[PDB]
Scaffold this active site. Structure first.
Site, PDB file in Angstrom:
ATOM      1  N   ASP A  75      39.097  16.552  11.958  1.00 58.63           N
ATOM      2  CA  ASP A  75      38.121  15.958  11.042  1.00 58.63           C
ATOM      3  C   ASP A  75      36.663  16.281  11.393  1.00 58.63           C
ATOM      4  O   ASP A  75      35.796  15.405  11.370  1.00 58.63           O
ATOM      5  CB  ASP A  75      38.347  14.439  10.978  1.00 58.63           C
ATOM      6  CG  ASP A  75      37.595  13.771   9.839  1.00 58.63           C
ATOM      7  OD1 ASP A  75      37.229  14.455   8.857  1.00 58.63           O
ATOM      8  OD2 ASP A  75      37.371  12.547   9.935  1.00 58.63           O
TER       9      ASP A  75
ATOM     10  N   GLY B  73      35.455   1.512   9.235  1.00 60.42           N
ATOM     11  CA  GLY B  73      36.395   2.546   8.806  1.00 60.42           C
ATOM     12  C   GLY B  73      37.611   1.962   8.105  1.00 60.42           C
ATOM     13  O   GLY B  73      37.645   0.766   7.791  1.00 60.42           O
TER      14      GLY B  73
HETATM   15  N1  LIG Z   1      28.999   6.898  20.139  1.00 62.28           N
HETATM   16  C1  LIG Z   1      28.146   6.581  19.147  1.00 62.28           C
HETATM   17  N2  LIG Z   1      26.835   6.379  19.404  1.00 62.28           N
HETATM   18  C2  LIG Z   1      25.955   6.062  18.435  1.00 62.28           C
HETATM   19  N3  LIG Z   1      26.298   5.917  17.144  1.00 62.28           N
HETATM   20  C3  LIG Z   1      27.585   6.090  16.746  1.00 62.28           C
HETATM   21  C4  LIG Z   1      28.608   6.437  17.746  1.00 62.28           C
HETATM   22  N4  LIG Z   1      29.772   6.547  17.085  1.00 62.28           N
HETATM   23  C5  LIG Z   1      29.521   6.288  15.780  1.00 62.28           C
HETATM   24  N5  LIG Z   1      28.218   6.023  15.582  1.00 62.28           N
HETATM   25  C6  LIG Z   1      27.565   5.689  14.298  1.00 62.28           C
HETATM   26  O1  LIG Z   1      28.266   4.600  13.680  1.00 62.28           O
HETATM   27  C7  LIG Z   1      28.900   5.138  12.517  1.00 62.28           C
HETATM   28  C8  LIG Z   1      29.312   4.108  11.475  1.00 62.28           C
HETATM   29  O2  LIG Z   1      30.720   4.218  11.236  1.00 62.28           O
HETATM   30  P1  LIG Z   1      31.451   5.584  10.775  1.00 62.28           P
HETATM   31  O3  LIG Z   1      32.745   5.193  10.099  1.00 62.28           O
HETATM   32  O4  LIG Z   1      31.484   6.553  11.932  1.00 62.28           O
HETATM   33  O5  LIG Z   1      30.460   6.201   9.665  1.00 62.28           O
HETATM   34  P2  LIG Z   1      30.812   6.048   8.104  1.00 62.28           P
HETATM   35  O6  LIG Z   1      29.705   6.715   7.326  1.00 62.28           O
HETATM   36  O7  LIG Z   1      31.077   4.576   7.883  1.00 62.28           O
HETATM   37  N6  LIG Z   1      32.292   6.938   7.817  1.00 62.28           N
HETATM   38  P3  LIG Z   1      33.766   6.092   7.402  1.00 62.28           P
HETATM   39  O8  LIG Z   1      33.653   4.759   8.103  1.00 62.28           O
HETATM   40  O9  LIG Z   1      34.881   6.961   7.933  1.00 62.28           O
HETATM   41  O10 LIG Z   1      33.713   6.001   5.893  1.00 62.28           O
HETATM   42  C9  LIG Z   1      27.928   6.186  12.017  1.00 62.28           C
HETATM   43  O11 LIG Z   1      26.740   5.553  11.523  1.00 62.28           O
HETATM   44  C10 LIG Z   1      27.636   6.866  13.329  1.00 62.28           C
HETATM   45  O12 LIG Z   1      26.425   7.613  13.266  1.00 62.28           O
END
Ligand SMILES: Nc1ncnc2c1ncn2[C@@H]1O[C@@H](COP(=O)(O)OP(=O)(O)NP(=O)(O)O)[C@@H](O)[C@H]1O
Ligand SMILES: Nc1ncnc2c1ncn2[C@@H]1O[C@@H](COP(=O)(O)OP(=O)(O)NP(=O)(O)O)[C@@H](O)[C@H]1O
Ligand SMILES: Nc1ncnc2c1ncn2[C@@H]1O[C@@H](COP(=O)(O)OP(=O)(O)NP(=O)(O)O)[C@@H](O)[C@H]1O
Ligand SMILES: Nc1ncnc2c1ncn2[C@@H]1O[C@@H](COP(=O)(O)OP(=O)(O)NP(=O)(O)O)[C@@H](O)[C@H]1O
Ligand SMILES: Nc1ncnc2c1ncn2[C@@H]1O[C@@H](COP(=O)(O)OP(=O)(O)NP(=O)(O)O)[C@@H](O)[C@H]1O
Ligand SMILES: Nc1ncnc2c1ncn2[C@@H]1O[C@@H](COP(=O)(O)OP(=O)(O)NP(=O)(O)O)[C@@H](O)[C@H]1O
Ligand SMILES: [Ca+2]
Ligand SMILES: [Ca+2]
Ligand SMILES: [Ca+2]
Ligand SMILES: [Mg+2]
Ligand SMILES: [Mg+2]
Ligand SMILES: [Mg+2]
Ligand SMILES: [Mg+2]
Ligand SMILES: [Mg+2]
Ligand SMILES: [Mg+2]
Lengths: 259, 236, 260, 266, 252, 260
Positions: B137, B21
């Site tokens: 969000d 992030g």
């Molecule tokens: N508690 C959890 N259990 C399993 N998977 C999770 C959990 N929390 C987050 N994820 C996964 O891990 C995330 C990767 O980082 P995240 O930032 O949430 O997505 P992103 O598409 O990178 N959005 P951003 O990072 O805000 O641009 C996503 O792939 C989620 O599906």
């Protein structure tokens, strides 16, 4: 690494198992719901700087052996330390010895040999890690479960000298009374356990602390009142009054009696 | 505060990076003590624009969110550089992947299926609102399925422009903000596309289109709370 | 018989409605005692058009069906209003999704894979026909995968209870004339097999009449999706217009197609 | 000191379901009659042996000794008169190929996601190369997911046994030098490179209507990077070029690949 | 090598030998961990050089023992064999020997319930009736050869250590056993001796020599109908001794 | 709510554990889950009060949810019997821990008894607030969850004896003899158990019922190696007048629980 909260937020303290210096508690971890045991060390009584204690516990944690108690995590606040360990469910080795004399029977040489095998293997291991237990005895040896063939686990490693009667000296090597603390005192204490397992008696009994220590220093223990020769030989070796000539843990393992 | 003897790597095996992030990483982890699988959101303290006290208090309250449709935060750890939020693992994963799936497969999602998902979402919303929390969000990528089962529950993750309410542009962030976002999610789930792309064009049942107008009502004050949304006839 | 001190709500926590039919609703539940997940088929006794003794009899036989490819029924409870069939839960989902996903990916289901499915399906049929049950409604929406693995076993669900297109696409010709025998299940299974291997239904129309007459008289297209001659043979056997000459499940299992 | 089980494989295992027919023999979903834990067994017919059975046991023992979170775990190996039975853990994912094909249908797998798979892959390769093992048959159909979770780890399966027992898909992943029978650990790096290309572009780098057309393209042609690698970062393409280096001597090891800037980017 | 299934490796590749539980007349007994599952098992090693019979009969006899599938018989999973040994792989019991509960009772001063001993005897007699229908004679029924599955007060029992002594190289011995007459009825006698021991805390024919006990067994606070069953089971002539299925039908 | 089959269709009756004045106790396996349970069978024909009163007392017992009270999962009923379905305890009766100590000549420490008493009085505070009087507290009605030394306790066998149709008299409060049954009598019985646990003796022994009653009513127990604070708590819990006997919540506040 700091945790947002206190031990109470991490563990449910279910019950006090004992106290010294500090309490021992049966515990449930809030996140996993897994049962643990916590030994609380009150940093109050630290008559030696915490640096040598933080290190000494650090190495006890590194002790990875099937017959040594597993410490998972050590936590600390301003007042006291929390040694988080695995739970044993089979009670103290003392209970098996006491139940033997009460039932009017003996423990087999075979069963005791196997128990001593686990014990001396543990001693060989932590002696390699340069640890001296300093307080080996039946109440500090636990069974993991309640099955007859339960493996053994050594607990309550001695830290007392860093916190400063008759019953206390029963497992103490003669040289310890002169403040000579070496790994060889563990061998002595192991040998007293062995004698106790095999005879149902303690090799040096008394009404006072002095009687015990003078007896252990100068008298050979009674062997008569029913053991094999190879058993006696190993006992006479482990209970040699002179620490220099007493064998190490590795050499005990190589004795004929384990055959 | 409680000190641990060791580091974050002494408590956790970091398996794989799930994402990065603006203010930290998300990792699949294994707890060394239990062998249990968790996921850690690492927060870089460098990126903090507000004194740590406010960000710490915001997290502790989220940790307190105990609801079957909100992510379970188990524990929170800190060092000099980072905070570490230890949460349960979802194996689902993203609700988005369900939309994109039906999007390509031709047919759209059942009104009965979406009703059940909205019910869980709103029950979750009503709960964390009563605990005085605004999500800010909500979007299909911030809602995970707990497992790979077709009937899997959903779990809302990533508590904090296509899902933003009109009020939020004027800095008016309130508990009503989530309702709008959820209304946008509901629109996306039923129609197959977003409502405001670049008032919305609407097919759905009469009882359903009534809710979308209520939830996506442009005035925050007239917008219904999650508790009242769950009383709608579209769920019955 | 036994009574429970409470209601189905005291016994189960209803988590989510999975679907709704004419006889009643399907729910994902949790047993209060164990925390164990089940799915409950609710049957509204209002919609009974036959004496309620015969409905209890059929459901009782269905419960006794113990086989690795037939959904397990643990218990049947009943209110003044409803019957409650307590089933194991499949993480699935429907076999239809496997077919639908293959059309999207443009990758035809291999015979080796369909052979295994048909082996489990026909075994289940051999078993419950052995017990004098006619499912009456075999189709991909009524076959679930136990789990999400590529090699997940199947579980036949939703045994027919008509005593209270779409399904018509799987209907044996003699069923239209109200002749329901175990053979109609063989036909349905054949249609499933055809669908699995080709990604097409064999009898397609814009009306229930068009479909019925095609099922009764039309020979399906066997060259679309190249099929082996042994698969084609079995299909023709399973899709024989005459029930009296259509093979039994036991017989189908002994076909040479299940050797490759 | 040979050990025998008193009975047959059938006394030991219920054969539940045929998973398929590999390059060396069948694969079955299996249940141990004792536990009764699920396993998969690979049945290889000893008919096909090209080398003494003593030597095959030795080479299979080395594969059994491979202990890594991204390498299929082999529990036991049994034999009767005609067959060798490799008993291994069950994966539920299943094939890496399935995920590539699904992305091709949806419109492609992101660089971040593929970075994590390649990490697991190259780690596994670094490990088994350090145990003196050459896989020789790396491809998406020979890589399994443990489960169906988006974030499931991978398990490499079907280590090559071509020198022990006597295809068109394998050709597509085959390093230039192995066509000329020079088979070293560097051939696994090429194959992993071809897999990487495929994961990131949705395309194979080298395609043809014949075996020879494929061979010569792999040997001399530079992949259509300009057309097929449009969505990719320059550091990704750099690593692809390094792994798909024609001469194996200049090709990097699994350890060196793991140090590439691409893994440190995202 | 008797057309058995070949394993690539040794018994040490399959099993971690953790603890020696005992040394038998022709092999050891070990607490064992199966490497693949991490599951706990017990292995009885049998030394083949100790056999006084062709190895086929030994394998065939163990084969039917392995086929014994009953809630109160020890489960045997597999049997392995190398050049020197056979390895009988069985489930782990955790409750100790039946002898323990008897020794523990007489030490405390109290005697075990009729109700408790009956339920225990029901499990035992059900196991016998089963393995008799499978043409197996145990030959060595006794309190140390009956284990509790777990350590719960209401634990079921598992019969272990089926007799095999004759294929190699007195308190519970039937009279005809001293005269080479080995039959399924001798298990009935033994079961009766165990029952008497369970109900009284004494062994019915107690001596300090083989000839002393053999002669006394040949000719020599419990409720009436309990004694009635004991007298039936301890009938000197095996012909007039009831079967296991018959003992089950007793009013007690 | 009605179940299709009978009680034997959902439970396998494994072993008879005991027998009572109005039924039996069995160790049981649940057919659906394979989980061990314990079933208390109540014979309906041995009732003395209207069936509704028994139904109701059992209902509130099932509502008892506490770490130190036996969990009742469900209650079933046919024409002849009621079936109370309980969780299983593995550790045996508390009496066994006391009998075992007397056999070793040793004594149960005050620290061990304090913890035991803490759990017990906590359970008493809980169920008293739920308007339940146990009426039959004693070491055979207190089980250990497991066989480990530090196992929690579960109270079982809540008294119902007066709804149907000496050694229970050994734990009987003086006022219970005069038919005055309140939550206070539980405190007395808890006191008798504590006395038993600490000394290895029962406070009032008698060759007959009359002797036990008179001793309990008028005579002080032999208090002479207990700490002054233990004796103080015993004296309070064993106060003849129920009015002056402390509640369970009061007892928890005692100094004896603070020092041990
Ligand atoms: N508690 C959890 N259990 C399993 N998977 C999770 C959990 N929390 C987050 N994820 C996964 O891990 C995330 C990767 O980082 P995240 O930032 O949430 O997505 P992103 O598409 O990178 N959005 P951003 O990072 O805000 O641009 C996503 O792939 C989620 O599906
Ligand atoms: N890891 C463990 N699992 C289970 N029981 C344990 C564990 N550690 C300790 N115990 C038990 O709890 C203990 C309580 O008393 P104890 O440990 O002797 O007190 P202490 O703190 O050692 N002080 P002292 O008596 O002076 O040595 C003993 O009863 C042990 O059997
Ligand atoms: N045992 C089960 N485990 C998991 N899902 C199930 C199970 N039984 C049924 N389902 C699902 O619930 C069903 C919902 O009903 P569905 O069959 O779609 O409508 P219908 O067949 O027209 N009438 P009905 O299903 O009887 O309400 C389908 O979604 C099934 O996939
Ligand atoms: N350890 C394992 N766990 C689960 N599945 C496995 C395992 N090993 C192999 N498989 C599966 O079984 C394999 C069957 O081999 P394969 O060579 O595809 O046979 P096939 O029927 O000839 N298919 P194809 O070559 O495409 O015609 C693949 O389908 C794998 O997905
Ligand atoms: N399946 C099992 N589970 C747990 N313990 C077992 C099992 N089988 C045997 N034992 C224990 O291991 C045994 C040790 O050997 P034991 O049975 O005493 O001698 P043996 O080998 O039978 N020959 P003998 O010395 O003549 O009796 C006893 O301690 C049994 O309680
Ligand atoms: N939930 C339980 N788990 C394990 N054992 C139990 C459970 N409930 C009862 N028992 C045991 O079964 C009991 C045998 O019956 P018992 O409790 O004596 O009958 P009762 O109902 O008390 N009638 P009575 O003894 O005649 O007043 C005791 O041995 C208990 O230890
Ligand atoms: Ca933790
Ligand atoms: Ca139930
Ligand atoms: Ca095995
Ligand atoms: Mg201690
Ligand atoms: Mg996000
Ligand atoms: Mg249906
Ligand atoms: Mg392959
Ligand atoms: Mg024996
Ligand atoms: Mg009772």
């Amino acid at each position: 690494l700091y945790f947002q909260g206190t031990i109470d937020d991490l563990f449910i303290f279910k019950r006090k198992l004992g106290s010294g210096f500090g309490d021992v508690h049966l515990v449930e971890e809030r996140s996993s719901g897994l049962e643990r045991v916590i030994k609380t060390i009150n940093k109050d009584r630290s008559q030696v700087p915490m640096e040598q204690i933080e290190a000494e516990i650090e190495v006890l944690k590194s002790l990875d052996h099937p017959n040594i108690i597993k410490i998972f995590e050590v936590f600390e606040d301003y007042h006291n330390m929390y040694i988080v360990m695995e739970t044993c469910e089979g009670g103290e080795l003392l209970e098996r010895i006491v139940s033997a004399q009460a039932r009017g029977k003996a423990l087999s040489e075979g069963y005791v040999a196997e128990l001593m095998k686990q014990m001396m293997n543990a001693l060989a291991y932590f002696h390699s890690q340069h640890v001296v237990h300093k307080d080996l005895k039946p109440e500090n040896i636990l069974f993991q479960d309640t099955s007859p063939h339960s493996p053994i686990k050594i607990i309550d490693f001695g830290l007392a000298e860093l916190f400063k009667a008759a019953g206390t000296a029963l497992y103490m090597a003669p040289e310890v009374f002169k403040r000579d603390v070496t790994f060889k005192c563990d061998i002595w204490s192991a040998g007293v356990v062995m004698y106790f397992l095999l005879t149902g008696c303690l090799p040096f009994t008394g009404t006072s602390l002095e009687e015990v220590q003078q007896k252990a220093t100068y008298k050979e223990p009674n062997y008569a009142v029913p053991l094999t020769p190879q058993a006696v030989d190993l006992l006479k070796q482990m209970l040699t009054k002179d620490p220099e000539r007493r064998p190490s843990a590795a050499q005990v393992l190589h004795h004929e009696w384990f055959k």
